[PDB]
């Protein structure tokens, strides 16, 4: 499944690739945004 | 007849022989695996590509059981 991360308290995006059915229901790895610095990023 | 196939030629092998002057960052050798090990002043990339790390001269060293090496002896 194709995917793109969204930044919290905001709406940044980034390149990504989930995997759906396989062990991966939730997803929120870290990633550095341009504005501010370092924050969690939801699946979406 | 199922057979008329093959894949692109990758033009690999040694890209800079011994004694040849080299600029920092330029490539020394492209290879399938580590047919050549890095060594002094020579880094290696994801594909096993060897690239000079500073202006200098290329020289090759064989070390038997430990394999062949590519070196850049600096000077400036």
């Amino acid at each position: 499944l194709l995917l793109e991360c969204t930044e919290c308290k905001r709406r940044n995006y980034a390149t990504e690739k989930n995997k759906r059915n396989t062990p991966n229901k939730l997803e929120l790895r870290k990633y550095c945004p341009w504005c501010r610095k370092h924050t969690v990023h939801r699946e979406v | 007849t199922k057979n008329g196939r093959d894949s692109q030629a990758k033009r690999l092998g040694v890209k800079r022989y011994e004694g040849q002057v080299v600029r920092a960052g330029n490539i020394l050798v492209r290879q399938r695996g580590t047919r050549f090990k890095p060594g002094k002043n020579v880094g290696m990339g994801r594909d096993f590509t060897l690239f000079a790390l500073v202006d200098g001269v290329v020289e090759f060293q064989d070390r038997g059981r430990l394999g062949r090496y590519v070196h850049v002896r600096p000077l400036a």
């Binding site: 194709l2 390149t15 990504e16 690739k17 | -």
Partner: protein, 63 residues
Amino acid sequence: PKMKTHKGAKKRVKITASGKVVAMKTGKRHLNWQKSGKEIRQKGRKFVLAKPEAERIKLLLPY
């Protein structure tokens, strides 16, 4: 009579002051998915042509 500028070209290329010709890198609006972040950062910089720079220039001239 009177050559017409090629609008298709003008809409995607520029003549530099020295007579060079530049355009955005191709392949960055589709194939996208997670190609190394490095790639797309480098698909942003525009580049110069070579021989079609001359083919290209002819298509302008009033420009």
